Amino acid sequence: KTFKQRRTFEQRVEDVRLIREQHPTKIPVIIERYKGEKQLPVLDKTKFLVPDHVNMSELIKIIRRRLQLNANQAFFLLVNGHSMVSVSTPISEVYESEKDEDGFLYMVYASQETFGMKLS
Amino acid sequence: DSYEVLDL
């Protein structure tokens, strides 16, 4: 069961409304392991607040170490199901362009080899 | 249920 499945559409909209009042300079981001991804570990939490000045390069780095990944274990962040955002892009811009209808910004993480394997 | 702040 994903985050969207355990909580209705109305609950998530309200949830976004409230947390944005509390943190006007943070982006609410839902970060989950991609369903086909078995090699990379799971995170302990699903819901994150990222400071809105952060770029994608910095967010990947934060997720890397929070995942305790080794030198050469690559992972890709797919945003809003369909997008691979250039690393320099600020997340505030990614929020405004890629946020879900419910007001969350959704991401899944997977190795390139996992995304490759699934496309093939 | 709580959020986690991801700072650098």
Numbering used by the authors:
A (entry chain B): 5 to 124
B (entry chain D): 16 to 23
Show me the paper's own sentences about this structure:
We chose a FUNDC1 LIR peptide10–25 with pS17, which simulates the possible physiological state upon the induction of mitophagy and exhibits a strong binding affinity for LC3B, to co-crystallize with full-length LC3B1–125. The crystal structure of the LC3B-FUNDC1 complex was subsequently refined to a resolution of 2.25 Å in space group P 21. In the final model, the LC3B-FUNDC1 complex includes two molecules in an asymmetric unit both with observable electronic densities for 120 amino acid residues of LC3B5–124 and a main part of the FUNDC1 pS17 peptide16–23 (D-pS17-YEVLDL). The LC3B in complex with FUNDC1 exhibits four-stranded anti-parallel β sheets (β1–β4) separated by five α-helices (α1–α5) which is highly similar to the structure of apo LC3B (with r.m.s. deviations for Cα atoms of 0.695 Å). The side chains of FUNDC1 Tyr18 and Leu21 insert into two deep hydrophobic pockets of LC3B, resulting in specific recognitions between LC3B and FUNDC1. The pocket accommodating the side chain of Tyr18 is mainly composed of several hydrophobic residues including Ile23, Lys51 and Leu53 of LC3B, and forms a hydrogen bond between the carbonyl oxygen of LC3B Asp19 and the hydroxyl group of FUNDC1 Tyr18. Structural analysis shows that the enhancement of binding affinity induced by FUNDC1 pS17 is due to an additional hydrogen bond formed between LC3B Lys49 and the phosphate group of FUNDC1 pS17. However, in the complex structure, a largely shift (8.2 Å) of the Lys49 side chain is induced by its interaction with the pS17 of FUNDC1, providing enough space to accommodate the FUNDC1 LIR, especially the side chain of Glu19. In our complex structure, the N-terminus of the FUNDC1 pS17 peptide10–15, including Ser13, was not visible in the electron density map.
Interestingly, several reports have revealed that the outer membrane region of FUNDC1 interacts with LC3B and regulates hypoxia-induced selective mitophagy through the reversible phosphorylation at several critical sites.
